[PDB]
């Protein structure tokens, strides 16, 4: 491989790729009005979508914008199955040419790196280096602040294909601040966007012990003054370059626990977030006093996987004391 990338809409619109995009788009959504209305003439619908992409006549359908409010209110704009399919067709050829350049410590929406690989890299990189302190930051409204202009200085430093560059600009117009949260194309463009601060930590600033998950950035250190300087340098950059205000940040010692990704992470141990605990607690509590104790076993087995890492037992005892049911 070596730069350029100047004929991607040929691969984007390859039948074997749109079938992958169709499979990807339908994976898990096979109970939904979108798939069931599409599944009817599926291979025919892929043909009028291929011929709409391959012609340069694809127009992204309007987001239906509701607001899920669960952990906090977020304006989640969903997309038609045809549009999520086109995003999947783009992020099959366009994603692995951005996700390749992402430094190894970015653990968001990438294959084989995830929520856990992050909490493990932070714990690990906490044991080695024997970090005395740690800077944790977070970007205010990350998706509703991505410049959608300076983003298209990175999505146009890699795509080079004058047609794919126009399909990315039909999916995400290159106008003003605001990447739609609730879009595959968006998770990618945000990890790429946040990857700018990765290069300013790793390349400039020469910070080698760090981790980013989308907007959350841990930077384990040894002095709490260099880490504060690194943040100031990171904040000044992400503000004057990327238009991202830092909502919360903390240069705490590795003693306060690194609230990273649903785990408070010490060098030695690593609990969970109290919110996840209480959410699951109340979710089970409701499920019991609603009338489901067989799907609870499916959930319990699920959450026993999310908690097998954490040093829990601060819920399973609690559950067993509230209802007596044999958790573990």
């Amino acid at each position: 491989m070596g730069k350029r990338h100047r004929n991607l809409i040929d691969q984007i619109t390859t039948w074997e790729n749109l079938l992958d995009a169709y499979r990807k788009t339908s994976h898990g959504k096979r109970r939904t009005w979108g798939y069931l209305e599409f599944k009817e003439y599926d291979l025919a619908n892929l043909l009028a979508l291929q011929a709409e992409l391959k012609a340069g006549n694809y127009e992204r359908g309007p987001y239906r914008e509701f607001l899920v409010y669960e952990p906090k209110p977020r304006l989640i704009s969903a997309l038609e199955f045809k549009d999520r399919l086109v995003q999947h067709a783009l992020c099959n050829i366009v994603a692995p040419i951005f996700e390749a350049g992402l430094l190894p410590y970015t653990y968001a929406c990438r294959p084989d790196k995830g929520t856990h690989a992050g909490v493990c890299h932070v714990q690990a990189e906490l044991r080695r280096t024997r970090a005395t302190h740690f800077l944790k930051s977070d970007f205010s409204k990350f998706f509703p602040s991505i410049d959608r202009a300076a983003l298209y200085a990175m999505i146009d430093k890699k795509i080079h294909c004058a047609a794919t560059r126009r399909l990315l600009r039909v999916v995400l117009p290159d106008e003003g601040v605001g990447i739609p949260i609730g879009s595959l194309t968006s998770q990618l463009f945000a990890n790429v966007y946040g990857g700018a601060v990765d290069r300013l930590l790793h390349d400039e600033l020469k910070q080698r012990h760090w981790a980013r998950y989308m907007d959350d950035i841990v930077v384990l250190g040894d002095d709490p003054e260099e880490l504060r300087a690194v943040f100031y340098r990171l904040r000044d950059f992400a503000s004057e370059r990327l238009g991202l205000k830092i909502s919360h940040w903390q240069v705490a010692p590795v003693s306060r626990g690194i609230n990273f990704l649903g785990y408070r992470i010490w060098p030695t141990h690593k609990l969970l977030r109290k919110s996840s605990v209480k959410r699951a607690k109340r979710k089970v509590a409701n499920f019991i006093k609603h009338g489901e104790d067989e799907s609870l076993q499916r959930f319990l087995a699920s959450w026993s996987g999310h908690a097998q890492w954490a040093d829990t037992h601060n819920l399973f005892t609690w559950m067993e004391e509230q209802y007596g049911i044999a958790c573990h």
Binding site: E40, Y41, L43, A44
Partner: protein, 114 residues
């Protein structure tokens, strides 16, 4: 009766394409074949009865037949034993049935709009 004659003539292209596919299905998938043939050739009677009357329910039963034909393409594409309707053949057939669905759709609207 323009739409009934048109819808059949357009459906004849589905038959013209799918009957050779339907005849090639191995006797193993024999029941699936005989049911697919009765669904393919039997859709004509659904169109005929729809034209023979004016009830929009008859044009909906024609839509159900076309939906059942679309299922058969999906099903015969799956059947992984002897194997049948290759994915290309489901693609080409879905295009043909869509034009039959298009004329039936305009037909249903003509009846619903008196």
């Amino acid at each position: 009766c323009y739409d009934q004659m048109l819808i059949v003539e357009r459906y004849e292209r589905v038959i013209s394409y799918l009957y050779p596919i339907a005849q090639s299905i191995p006797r193993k998938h024999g029941v699936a074949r005989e049911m697919f043939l009765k669904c393919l050739l039997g859709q004509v009677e659904l169109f005929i009865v729809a034209g023979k009357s004016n009830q929009v329910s008859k044009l909906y039963a024609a839509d159900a037949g076309l939906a059942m034909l679309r299922f058969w393409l999906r099903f015969l594409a799956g059947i992984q034993k002897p194997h049948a309707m290759t994915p290309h053949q489901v693609e080409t057939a879905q295009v043909l049935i869509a034009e039959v669905g298009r004329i039936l759709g305009s037909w249903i609207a003509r009846v619903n709009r008196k």
